[PDB]
Write a structure and sequence with these properties.
Chain lengths: 133, 129
């Protein structure tokens, strides 16, 4: 039974930073991918950042490139999202996500980021991030 | 070795892929077509330093050992080079390990996109099986 638990986030002033972390429990092998998605009020959920647990290659949505850094600790099945230079526009519910499929051939975890989370079968409950104007 | 379609179908059936884990033979021949064009020596280098090997392009970060990415897994417990052999036994055995538990042939994206739901039996049509 896969379970993703995240912590961190909260409120901050524009220009500030927050660090999100997420721990997967219930896997024996994998996940293959872990990532962050977010959903602002009344909007569609969108991708933020992803990482291959196998290899650490990272992927970012154009909206956060250069400001956010995603990282992993493969042995502990944990992923982190360092968010610098936050802006009011980054306010949203942030979701930790994982793709549990152990692909046969190489798979780029950034694929799900723009295809509405395709492949990401497990999701956290959601963590609020609020950035003051 | 570049296998002929029926020749590969025949070899996969001899090694037990026909109906393995709910997948009729054509599924496997079709996956191999879109992964390697039936060439056992096919390899592809990925950005993380891993490499995909063989007729089914099995990845070295998880499934086999080539020594190039220290600390990676070797779930099939074989040297990746065995997956480039003209004898497909190692590729077949490792493919059977890949499709186990909740991991179906979706583990092969090309199979999902080019084979899944198609008339896969056409890949073995006309073959002396
Ligand atoms: Na709405
Ligand atoms: Na891991
Ligand atoms: Na998945
Ligand atoms: Na491929
Ligand atoms: Na390996
Ligand atoms: Na299996």
């Amino acid at each position: 039974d896969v379970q993703l638990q995240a912590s961190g986030g909260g409120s901050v002033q524009a220009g500030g930073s927050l660090r999100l972390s997420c721990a997967a429990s219930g896997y024996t092998i994998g996940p293959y991918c872990m990532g962050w998605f977010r959903q602002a009020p009344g909007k569609e959920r969108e991708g933020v950042a992803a990482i291959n647990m196998g290899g650490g290659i990272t992927y970012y949505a154009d909206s956060v490139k250069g400001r956010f850094t995603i990282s992993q600790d493969n042995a502990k099945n944990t992923v982190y999202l360092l968010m610098n230079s936050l802006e009011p526009e980054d306010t949203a519910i942030y979701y930790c996500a994982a793709d549990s499929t152990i692909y046969a051939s190489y798979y780029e975890c950034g694929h799900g980021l723009s295809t509405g989370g395709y492949g990401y079968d497990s999701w956290g409950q959601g963590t609020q991030v609020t950035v003051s104007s | 070795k570049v296998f002929g379609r029926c020749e590969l179908a025949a070899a996969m059936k001899r090694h037990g892929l026909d109906n393995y884990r709910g997948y009729s033979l054509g599924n496997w021949v079709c996956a191999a077509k879109f992964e390697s064009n039936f060439n056992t020596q096919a390899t592809n280098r990925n950005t993380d330093g891993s490499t995909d090997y063989g007729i089914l392009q099995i990845n070295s970060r998880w499934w086999c050992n080539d020594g190039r990415t220290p600390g990676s897994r070797n779930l099939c417990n074989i040297p990746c080079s065995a997956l480039l052999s003209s004898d497909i036994t190692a590729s077949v055995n490792c493919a059977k390990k890949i499709v186990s538990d909740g991991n179906g042939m979706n583990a092969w994206v090309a199979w999902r996109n080019r084979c899944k739901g198609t008339d896969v039996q056409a890949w073995i049509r006309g073959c002396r099986l």
